[PDB]
Amino acid sequence: KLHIMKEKWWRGQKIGGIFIVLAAGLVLSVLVAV
Amino acid sequence: LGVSILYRKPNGTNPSVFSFLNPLSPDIWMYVLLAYLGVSVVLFVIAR
Amino acid sequence: GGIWWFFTLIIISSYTANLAAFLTVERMESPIDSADDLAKQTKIEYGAVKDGATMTFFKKSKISTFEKMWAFMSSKPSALVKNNEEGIQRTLTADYALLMESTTIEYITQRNCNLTQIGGLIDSKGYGIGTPMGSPYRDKITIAILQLQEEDKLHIMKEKWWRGQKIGGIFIVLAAGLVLSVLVAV
Amino acid sequence: LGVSILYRKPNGTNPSVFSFLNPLSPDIWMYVLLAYLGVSVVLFVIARALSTRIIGGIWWFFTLIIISSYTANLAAFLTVERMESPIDSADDLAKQTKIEYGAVKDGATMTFFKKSKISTFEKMWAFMSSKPSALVKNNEEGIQRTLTADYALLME
Amino acid sequence: STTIEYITQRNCNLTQIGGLIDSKGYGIGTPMGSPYRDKITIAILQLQEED
């Protein structure tokens, strides 16, 4: 109860965006159709 | 004789591909082929 | 396709250098043999016979490595225990090394397969045989010691009484090629 | 004059070819061999095309892993091979304990450094007296103590 | 070179190139026929034993 008194007184994915950095260039062959 | 010291042996053995794929995350390890297969299905789209 | 090429090269070089670096972590680490290791380490307990001739000798020793090792022992009685089996379980449980009699270590190591000896002998103590003072039979014992250690019967009796990577780890993928090639035709 | 220290350098060396293949274990080269033997016979079975192309691309990917792994092992040797560090000074010996050293035993060197009273250096004297069975005296004595054993020397 | 050492210890931006070139011995001037010279040599070797 020394220590119960002591309690009484004392207590109180690094690389994920790189894939979409690649995926930014996805619209490339879209407008080549004409 | 003279004074000398005993100790115990730290040990453990597990050589595997699980112990080979390790500095990259297994979720990111399947995300390798996740990001890959979009390329092959875009190949299959514009090829047909 | 060219930027995909570019990108995947970045990928493979990245994980390449990653596990390369971890491989260097593997090769860069050192094991421990000397007590100079113990003088520079702190985290591991180490000790001997409490109030033993070992312990008195570390009081009497004059090398500052062993002097501050002795000072560690003098400051910390928690590692400093007396009985043999006390220290045996202190080793088997806690991170504690034990400087002790090496022939006793030899007998211990024959009786447990979970141990490893560290280093060699620190010093030199000659357990000898004594006579009543002023005896020529001392010299008979001495010459018999010469001839019999010359015959190494002490060695025979000592053995008679004391005894009792991914280098290897990628070959799954090496073998994987045939179980690839079985289902390509039909 | 004064007193300095002598020792040999770099026991063991390796010229070609053994110093090149060395991180890679020899049976793994034979695994490369039998892998190549698996490669080199498929075309006659073909005589007996995305089908083999996906196999070749997985082979491609595999040998990328192979070369990346080996080069990783190479550079892993090289960096610790440059992380290496030798010692020179007597303070190195003042810190270490493993390496043996000595002077002309019962000579003017020995008694003079017995009378030399730098706490480091008379501490080294206490070291040298403390391991008495390592002591040799003469010239050929220290030559044989050095050529065979790890032993520095303190001589004219 | 001892002045060089005084320079290096006082100024934290110096790299010493090599060591000694030769032997130059500074002594304290005695007159010709000074009667104290043996005592000076004895005291020099004494102080060298004293460090």
Side-chain angles (χ1 to χ4, degrees), chain A, chain B residues 1-47, chain C residues 1-25 27-185, chain D residues 1-47 49 51-52 54-80 82-156, chain E:
Chain A
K1 309 164 179 159
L2 58 90
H3 205 48
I4 304 147
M5 188 158 100
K6 176 98 180 316
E7 308 325 296
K8 148 191 177 170
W9 283 96
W10 265 254
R11 283 200 152 184
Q13 294 194 359
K14 310 161 280 204
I15 323 95
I18 316 289
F19 315 143
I20 308 94
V21 162
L22 202 57
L26 279 175
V27 66
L28 320 177
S29 277
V30 174
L31 320 165
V32 197
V34 178
Chain B
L1 81 165
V3 192
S4 283
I5 294 91
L6 202 42
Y7 202 56
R8 60 194 187 276
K9 294 178 290 296
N11 265 266
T13 179
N14 276 316
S16 86
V17 179
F18 265 77
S19 77
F20 147 73
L21 301 152
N22 38 309
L24 190 161
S25 177
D27 292 314
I28 308 182
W29 274 113
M30 66 204 180
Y31 287 158
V32 186
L33 312 100
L34 173 139
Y36 165 66
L37 288 175
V39 178
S40 43
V41 305
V42 162
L43 259 173
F44 214 81
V45 159
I46 318 176
Chain C
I3 57 186
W4 151 264
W5 178 28
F6 185 76
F7 194 80
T8 51
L9 294 152
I10 303 148
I11 293 173
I12 63 185
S13 44
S14 63
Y15 182 65
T16 299
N18 196 334
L19 194 36
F22 180 70
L23 163 79
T24 71
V25 189
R27 300 296 295 167
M28 81 171 52
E29 180 57 32
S30 89
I32 290 304
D33 185 81
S34 64
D36 286 16
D37 309 329
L38 278 300
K40 69 183 185 173
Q41 76 91 31
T42 76
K43 59 169 291 297
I44 304 170
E45 288 182 350
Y46 46 105
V49 195
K50 172 171 162 317
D51 294 330
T54 71
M55 206 194 88
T56 75
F57 161 69
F58 317 131
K59 195 39 150 183
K60 294 317 180 172
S61 315
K62 297 295 182 182
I63 293 174
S64 314
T65 80
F66 312 130
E67 299 175 343
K68 304 308 304 165
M69 282 160 49
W70 160 254
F72 151 82
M73 297 147 199
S74 318
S75 45
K76 297 319 284 157
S78 42
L80 186 63
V81 310
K82 305 195 72 59
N83 311 327
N84 48 5
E85 196 39 66
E86 286 172 348
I88 288 156
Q89 299 300 319
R90 188 62 162 278
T91 48
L92 284 159
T93 50
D95 197 359
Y96 168 71
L98 175 45
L99 313 95
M100 50 169 296
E101 306 168 354
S102 52
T103 47
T104 318
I105 308 178
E106 174 197 358
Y107 209 91
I108 290 165
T109 44
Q110 283 275 358
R111 270 74 184 175
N112 274 315
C113 59
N114 9 327
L115 326 172
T116 182
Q117 188 269 336
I118 314 296
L121 305 178
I122 285 147
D123 44 346
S124 169
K125 315 292 163 262
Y127 287 165
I129 185 65
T131 178
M133 162 64 78
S135 88
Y137 282 72
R138 176 255 304 266
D139 313 298
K140 311 178 193 300
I141 292 156
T142 301
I143 300 155
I145 279 162
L146 298 176
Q147 302 324 286
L148 262 290
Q149 297 174 339
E150 183 177 1
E151 287 141 351
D152 284 327
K153 182 58 192 71
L154 287 191
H155 189 59
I156 312 166
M157 204 191 296
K158 195 80 183 295
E159 299 167 352
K160 160 206 185 185
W161 278 105
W162 261 254
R163 279 176 178 173
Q165 318 171 3
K166 263 59 63 180
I167 289 296
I170 312 301
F171 300 132
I172 288 180
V173 195
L174 157 79
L178 265 181
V179 63
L180 307 193
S181 48
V182 289
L183 214 47
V184 70
Chain D
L1 72 159
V3 52
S4 171
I5 304 311
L6 189 84
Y7 202 54
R8 47 183 212 249
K9 181 54 193 97
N11 298 121
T13 182
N14 279 311
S16 172
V17 189
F18 289 92
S19 84
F20 148 73
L21 305 97
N22 45 324
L24 207 166
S25 315
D27 304 346
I28 316 177
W29 303 93
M30 309 158 206
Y31 299 151
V32 189
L33 183 149
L34 57 88
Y36 155 72
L37 306 180
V39 187
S40 43
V41 287
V42 194
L43 313 177
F44 209 85
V45 192
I46 289 154
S51 75
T52 46
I54 183 64
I55 318 169
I58 292 161
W59 167 255
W60 171 54
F61 165 63
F62 194 15
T63 184
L64 316 171
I65 304 148
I66 291 173
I67 63 151
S68 62
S69 67
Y70 189 37
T71 53
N73 191 341
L74 311 179
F77 163 67
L78 316 183
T79 319
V80 291
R82 180 47 205 99
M83 199 40 230
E84 302 169 351
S85 315
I87 66 167
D88 177 82
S89 82
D91 184 42
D92 320 342
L93 280 296
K95 305 321 286 169
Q96 78 97 38
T97 54
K98 175 186 71 66
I99 304 144
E100 193 197 336
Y101 57 93
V104 189
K105 180 197 172 301
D106 306 329
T109 72
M110 201 204 82
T111 71
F112 160 68
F113 285 106
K114 171 191 175 194
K115 299 308 147 185
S116 312
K117 293 183 183 294
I118 283 177
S119 87
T120 299
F121 295 154
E122 54 194 352
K123 203 179 295 178
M124 290 166 53
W125 158 262
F127 173 76
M128 276 177 286
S129 44
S130 70
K131 177 59 176 64
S133 44
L135 273 69
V136 308
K137 318 179 70 63
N138 305 316
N139 298 318
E140 199 36 70
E141 268 184 293
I143 290 183
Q144 288 327 289
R145 204 56 187 271
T146 316
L147 279 183
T148 74
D150 174 40
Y151 170 70
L153 306 89
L154 287 76
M155 170 59 187
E156 325 172 349
Chain E
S1 311
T2 174
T3 318
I4 285 159
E5 204 283 330
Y6 201 94
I7 286 152
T8 54
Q9 185 62 258
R10 264 71 180 173
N11 314 291
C12 73
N13 335 55
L14 275 304
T15 41
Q16 177 199 358
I17 320 292
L20 71 91
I21 279 168
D22 59 324
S23 158
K24 61 216 205 180
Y26 276 167
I28 291 306
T30 64
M32 178 78 73
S34 158
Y36 323 104
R37 187 254 319 280
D38 300 345
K39 182 161 97 136
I40 302 148
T41 53
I42 285 158
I44 277 167
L45 261 177
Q46 158 201 1
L47 262 288
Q48 278 149 357
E49 280 147 339
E50 286 169 10
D51 202 71

